[PDB]
């Protein structure tokens, strides 16, 4: 799609619903569920503490913390993956996914893995016990690690680890793995370097489904493939798996995730369309002082390998449902008419998650089968409708809720007339003019949007 | 998709394939059939004849012909729909669509109907008999008429009726119709003017299907709007629905329709991106002496009202699965590299149907879940995979057939090792070396091509 405007965004300013903020002190509070319980729960990624809100009353308890729990201020990781087993009131499970120090690791740069753990809940005395890890090892570091945990009607785990940022900034020279795959070797050595840029099945004791998909000839945890930053993961009513996942300076994604697929990340962002991208392979260039001039690989220093999107071979390439959002090659990711800072006017809206609106007795009108995506970037919750069976997007991505927030995850009631956002604690965000500003009206929040 | 080179077109040589050309010189032979009988039955347009042709010996009888078949010279009309009843044994009936004159219209200027029409064969005389008719008054013109005729799973008609040419060339200034749908007056008078660019559903009988999908407060024979040429239609074997369409200049399409889709045109081609097309209503325009620049609506003459796709108000709107092809706005739809005949050079490949590969006992390596789809101008077929429940397509759009003729229809025998294509009878294409040629290698044909 293509972008909308400062102006455009200002004036989604959904003046039909009240805002009230229910909680204001959270620290990087990060997932947000509807429990079994019908209790508010959400995670803070750097305490890794679990929190339990009373929806009507807006009391809180912190149910648990997660012990040790590696956070780095400048970094993504900490606590991430949580969700409830489905049949809780017979399997009293809670499963997370977070940062621990790895003692195995020797690379003083990735010190850290990523473990996939459960907890059993004890409700008579309210708190989490017997931990037991399901997957450990996972690759771990500060910059797109994604890590949204869901369990499917199938009854297993689908874990979304990004491409740990590799291919920028900090690990610009380390080659992306969101195209490899595990010899058989390496998954009998439970060696899971290649668990990047992925969505994971996993069985529910942590193992490989026998009918997981085949890549390149082994069938792992891996379902897909070729991910940057999935951040949203959500099945809907009749089964499938919408996704939301950040692009670089463009091309965030709306997928559909299907069994097998390569969603073609790094060689091809967004559409296979040779516009506003291409993969330029700093692992690749002879000369390790190169600079990265960061205009999306249309625009490189001499010395790294440069491949057009329709260069690349690729197998069971995917396209998704809808980019938020796709340029030109003649883009200006410079563009000195937004101001100093100008990545903020850069076509993108950073989605952080991805919810399937259910509706209920008190569905907003014209909601049906809507997908909610909200943006950390543009300080906006967008819903995106869908046709009835949830095979194809209609329309355009509807800005809603405009405010100088960064929005990091969102549900609705089961009536359907309130949602429940979390925001973060600090970061930039674009202002109503299209500047940007790092003063976030509701930092670390958890907020309510009623219908009126 | 981006678009392939020459060069790349012309190394598509199927060498995997035997052909043998088992009739040549038929008059605009159309639409081909795996029959009944496990004969092949064939259409010519211009005449409106029904040919059945023996697999093995190649001979030929003319079955039928439609009477009172009005074709024009330069005109895609004539006989255009055709099918068989799904359950022939107990129900020995053959769908047709054709261009009759309309004794009541009022307009010299289009004086014929396009009928849906049932006939019975007769197998003891071998021909057909006891004609129906079952929806007439439809639009007819010379141009953009489509009409794929197919039966669903669910016992109903669906019918692609063209925009009938209306925005370009001999129809440039008449206002297109396909964003619009009749109004309750309209259906009860059976003035059917807006159904163009579009694909009905109707009920065996002719009549309007009560499940029919609303448009604008009223249920017609309309099922998907928005479309220009679609001439490819294909149900897949879970019941979905899969369509080719041609664009302007650019965006041929390959579409999944669902109930109650509105597909762009000519609000958008291709995807609602802004890129390489723009909408110019010449029927808007300040005066008819204003001419078509014929560069996709991106540059235009003064005058001529234009809207660019993200400026469209639209509702339902679905984008293609692919697109052959998409181009960038600063793309030279005037390019001085081809000669004269910068149409060719065109990014599109004028698909002309559309046909979903089942297999069978002598199934074709790695063709699983394929549509095969051929181009008119690039003298190929496409092999275009999916997943294994159609609802993506994986990769890019994979050439075969390569020659210089223009193929206009092709189906796959049931052991799946034998495939039978028509070609057109006379047209432009393109050779190896990229430039235009209107010298057919197999003027009117019925080629087969069988696996080695
Ligand atoms: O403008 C863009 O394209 C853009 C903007 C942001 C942004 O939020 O400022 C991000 C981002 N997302 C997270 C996160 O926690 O999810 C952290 C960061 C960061 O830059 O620090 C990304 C990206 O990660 O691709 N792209
Ligand atoms: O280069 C292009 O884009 C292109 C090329 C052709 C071509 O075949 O020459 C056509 C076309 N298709 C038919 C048909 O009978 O299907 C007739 C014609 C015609 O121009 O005479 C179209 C189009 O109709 O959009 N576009
Ligand atoms: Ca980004
Ligand atoms: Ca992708
Ligand atoms: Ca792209
Ligand atoms: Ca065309
Ligand atoms: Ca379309
Ligand atoms: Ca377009």
């Known amino acids: 799609d293509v972008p909308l405007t400062p102006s455009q965004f200002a004036k989604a300013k959904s003046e039909n619903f009240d805002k009230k903020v ?80 790895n003692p195995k690791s020797t690379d003083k740069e990735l010190p850290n893995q990523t473990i996939i753990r459960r907890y059993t809940y004890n409700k008579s005395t309210d708190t989490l016990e017997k931990p037991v890890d399901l997957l450990a090892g996972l690759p771990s570091s500060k910059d797109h690690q994604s890590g949204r945990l869901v369990i499917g009607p199938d009854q297993k785990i689908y874990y979304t680890i990004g491409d740990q940022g590799r291919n920028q900034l900090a690990y610009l020279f380390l080659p992306n793995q969101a195209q490899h795959t595990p010899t058989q070797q390496e998954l009998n050595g439970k060696d899971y ?36 930053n999935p951040q949203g993961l959500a099945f809907t009513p009749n089964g499938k798996l919408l996704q939301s996942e950040q692009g670089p300076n463009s091309d965030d994604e709306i997928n559909l995730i299907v069994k097998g697929g390569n969603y073609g990340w790094p060689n091809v962002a967004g559409y296979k369309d040779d516009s506003g991208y ?45 980019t938020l959002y796709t340029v030109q090659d003649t883009y200006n990711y410079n563009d000195p008419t937004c101001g100093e800072m100008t990545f903020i006017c850069w076509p993108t809206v950073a989605p952080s998650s991805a919810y399937v609106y259910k509706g209920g007795k008190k569905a907003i009108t014209g909601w049906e089968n809507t997908l909610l995506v909200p943006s950390l970037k543009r300080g906006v919750i967008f819903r995106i409708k869908l046709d009835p069976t ?63």
Chains 1, 2 share one sequence.
Request: aromatic residues 10%; charged residues 20%.
């Open 22 to 101: 229910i909680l204001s002190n959270l620290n990087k509070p990060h997932a947000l569920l509807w429990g079994p319980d019908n209790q508010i729960w959400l995670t803070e990624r750097a305490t890794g503490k679990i929190l339990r809100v009373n929806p009507e009353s807006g009391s809180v308890k912190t149910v648990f913390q997660v012990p040790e729990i590696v956070n780095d201020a400048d970094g993504q990781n900490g606590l991430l993956g949580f969700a409830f087993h489905p049949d809780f009131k017979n399997n009293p499970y809670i499963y997370i996914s977070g940062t621990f120090k």
């Open 193 to 228: 370097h290649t668990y990047m840029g992925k969505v994971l099945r996993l069985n529910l004791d942590g193992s490989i489904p026998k009918d997981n998909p085949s890549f390149n000839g082994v069938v792992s945890h891996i379902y897909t493939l070729g991910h940057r």
């Open 390 to 452: 949830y095979s194809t997007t209609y329309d355009d991505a509807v800005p809603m809720f405009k405010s100088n927030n960064r929005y990091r995850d969102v549900i609705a009631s089961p009536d359907g007339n309130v949602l429940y956002v979390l925001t973060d604690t600090a970061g930039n965000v674009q202002k109503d003019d299209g500047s940007v500003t790092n003063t976030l009206e509701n930092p670390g929040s958890l907020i309510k949007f009623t219908y009126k």
């Open 278 to 322: 291409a993969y330029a392979n700093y692992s690749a260039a002879a000369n390790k002082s190169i600079k990265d001039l960061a205009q999306n690989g249309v625009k490189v220093a001499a010395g790294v390998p440069v491949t057009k999107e329709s260069e690349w071979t690729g197998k069971n390439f995917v396209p998704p449902l809808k």
